[PDB]
From Swiss-Prot:
Subcellular location: Cell outer membrane
Record's function text: Porin specific for oligogalacturonides. Also required for full virulence.
Organism listed in the record: Dickeya dadantii (strain 3937) (Erwinia chrysanthemi (strain 3937))
Name the record gives this protein: Oligogalacturonate-specific porin KdgM
Subunit relationships: Monomer.
Induction: Induced by pectin or pectin derivatives. Controlled by KdgR, ExuR, PecS and catabolite repression via CRP.
Gene symbol of the encoding locus: kdgM
Alphabetized UniProt keyword annotations: Cell outer membrane, Ion transport, Membrane, Porin, Signal, Sugar transport, Transmembrane, Transmembrane beta strand, Transport, Virulence
An annotated Gene Ontology molecular function: voltage-gated monoatomic ion channel activity
Length: 171
């Protein structure tokens, strides 16, 4: 089980607390409380299964619902992942959204170095139906077996988005 707090700012601010767990059988579940000001709030829940074909490739179908003051939306997904080495993995996710319509396509490259550091590149395309492009860089550090602080800097277009957070892992 892990508890992840994150603070986000652009250019008011957003906060989240994400609680999740991945079972050894590949089933996973998470719940996220979110709050923001420029005031708003919301709750997202996610269920998924990682099916691994082997040590290189896996697929992850997912289901999510969000309920909040601003909006609600349903966002199922399918993430493929390829571990090209022990230290290097790539993934691609298709995630439609239906909100009170469109999809995102998200590519990730994650590289672990010096045991405890991971640098991630993320490229995300969002297209509505009735483009935005994100370039995001994440650096995280496994401080000890329980704590992993991290920072991310991304562009959205023009505007810069900053995140700092920490993940707590239970043992
Ligand atoms: O229209 C709206 O409702 C909003 O649109 C905007 O939001 C963006 C984005 O478009 C949303 O999809 C969303 O992002 C997702 C999460 O909320 C966010 O914390 C983050 O997720 C991480 C991780 O990057 C992601 O890959 C995934 O992790 C999987 C899996 O779910 C986990 O269980 C675990 O197995 O690890 C996996 C992994 O590492 O890949 O979920 C993570 C998590 O924290 O749960 O990205 C998600 C995503 O990209 O889909 O919110 C964004 C936001 O900025 O809020 C817009 O910004 C907003 O204003 C609304 O209008
Ligand atoms: C393998 C499945 C393990 C699931 C364990 C987590 C379930 C523990 O119960 C928590 C339920 O909490 C309900 C909170 O109430 C909020 C109201 O909305 C809930 C609608 O589902
Ligand atoms: C055989 C294993 C399958 C692995 C699953 C990978 C995830 C599925 O990807 C779906 C591809 O959808 C791409 C849609 O692209 C639309 C056009 O691109 C956006 C430009 O406007
Ligand atoms: C297992 C910890 C995640 C909490 C999920 C709650 C689902 C309603
Ligand atoms: C009670 C929240 C969980 C709903 C999604 C679970 C689908 C398996
Ligand atoms: C609603 C279950 C998830 C479906 C995943 C395939 C479409 C993204
Ligand atoms: C401020 C860090 C949030 C996670 C800590 C979990 C407390 C048991």
């Amino acid at each position: 089980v892990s508890i992840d707090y994150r603070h986000e700012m652009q250019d008011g601010h957003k906060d989240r607390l994400l609680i999740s767990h991945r079972f050894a059988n590949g089933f996973g579940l998470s719940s996220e409380v979110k709050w923001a000001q420029s005031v708003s709030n919301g709750t997202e829940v996610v269920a998924s299964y990682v099916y691994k074909f082997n040590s290189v490739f896996s697929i992850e179908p997912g289901f999510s619902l969000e309920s909040g003051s601003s909006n609600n939306n349903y966002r199922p997904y399918l993430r493929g992942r390829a571990n090209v080495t022990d230290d290097l993995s790539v993934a691609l996710r298709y995630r439609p959204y239906f909100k009170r319509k469109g999809y995102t396509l998200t590519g990730n490259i994650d590289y672990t170095f010096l045991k405890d550091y991971t640098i991630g590149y993320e490229l995300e395309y969002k297209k509505g139906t009735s483009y935005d492009i994100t370039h995001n860089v994440k650096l995280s550090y496994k401080w000890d077996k329980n704590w992993k602080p991290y920072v991310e800097v991304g562009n959205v277009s023009r505007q810069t988005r900053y995140r700092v957070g920490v993940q707590y892992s239970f043992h």
